[PDB]
């Protein structure tokens, strides 16, 4: 029992069509290994200034016979500064024809995100706190846990195939693994945090140099680019020619010339001899205006986002606390086994 779900490559994010409520109201929502809560855009939400938050489906709680309004205020904040607020509730959620009942979600009535988010990370990382960090509501069974608990999958686990940079679609598989879509063997890596799907990154090879790292990296489907501590990012920027630019009082971004040569690869070395090779096309990102970002950016948090993850096949196992990885093989061939 595996559940395949199509991932829409939207550019900066990968989203899936899911349904919510007794009347199966279609929501197109970001598939996010970096958050743990599922929220939907209320049909009467107030979007953030300049944000078209109602173009990817909306949810009307009043037309679902099964919708339960829990008492409780919902608030979440993301790495890029975006936020959502609303109220906690429960309803039926349907994923590629497979329904789960009484799933706790948030009904969002204000958001600066473009669409809803389906957070599928650890339950310990749920957004169950007020602004000051006081816990306001209990931790609860999020979507992957509920899939397991209601007998839809055997193990709280999922495989991620973002597919190639040009592809319109990829696939996420809850409770299974597509053994046709990688070369070599999946190498199991220990998850190093009890809250975040992070594994140890031993080193990064770029432009003929090996840069020792030895710290955790978040494998985040819901991040576009790749983020590293400032000093490590600066070491890589030195080989690549990326230049740091101050864009706000506290924000700095690496820019790079749009016509920069993109031959060569960047290699990421993990535990147990696991290795992911990323083509350097992944490190030039086109902005609207004729400038480009470098695909690595500085941050206190280390995150391998989509520009990395497109080049790996990943089996996240939240029960075993492992993420198993192998170099991706882009193919329509498919041979899925349950996990």
């Amino acid at each position: 029992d595996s559940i395949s779900l199509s991932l829409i490559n939207e550019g900066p994010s990968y989203a899936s069509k899911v349904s919510v409520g007794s009347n199966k109201q279609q929501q197109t929502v970001i598939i996010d290994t970096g958050s743990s809560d599922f929220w939907v855009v209320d049909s009467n939400a107030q979007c953030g200034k300049g944000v078209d938050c109602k173009s990817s489906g909306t949810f009307t709680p009043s037309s679902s016979s099964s919708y339960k309004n829990l008492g409780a205020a919902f608030t979440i904040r993301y790495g890029d500064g975006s936020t959502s607020q609303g109220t906690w509730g429960k309803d039926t959620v349907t994923i590629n024809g497979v329904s789960i009942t009484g799933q706790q979600i948030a009904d969002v009535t204000q958001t600066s995100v473009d669409q809803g988010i389906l957070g599928i990370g650890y339950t310990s990382n749920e957004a169950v706190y007020d602004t000051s960090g006081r816990q306001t509501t209990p931790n609860y069974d999020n979507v992957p846990v509920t899939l397991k608990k209601q007998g839809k999958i055997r193990t709280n686990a999922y495989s991620l195939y973002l597919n190639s940079p040009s592809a319109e679609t990829g696939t996420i598989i809850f409770g299974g693994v597509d053994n046709a879509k990688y070369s070599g063997k999946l190498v199991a890596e220990q998850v190093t945090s009890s809250q975040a799907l992070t594994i140890s990154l031993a080193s990064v090879n770029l432009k003929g140099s090996s840069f020792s790292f030895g710290d955790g990296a978040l494998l985040d489907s819901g991040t576009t680019l790749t983020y590293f501590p400032s000093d490590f990012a600066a070491q890589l920027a030195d080989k690549a020619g990326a230049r740091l630019v101050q864009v706000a009082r506290d924000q700095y971004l690496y820019f790079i010339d749009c016509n920069t040569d993109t031959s060569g690869t960047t290699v990421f070395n993990f535990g147990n001899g696991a290795k992911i090779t990323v083509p350097n096309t992944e490190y030039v990102y086109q902005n609207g205006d004729g400038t480009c970002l470098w695909g690595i950016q500085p941050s206190d948090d280390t995150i391998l986002g989509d520009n990395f993850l497109r080049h790996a096949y990943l089996l996240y196992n939240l029960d075993a606390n492992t993420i198993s990885i192998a170099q991706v093989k882009y193919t329509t061939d498919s041979s899925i086994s349950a996990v």
Binding site: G34, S36, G79, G119, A127, D220, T223, G305
Partner: peptide, 5 residues
């Protein structure tokens, strides 16, 4: 984008 806290 960069998805929690």
């Amino acid at each position: 984008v960069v998805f929690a806290f």
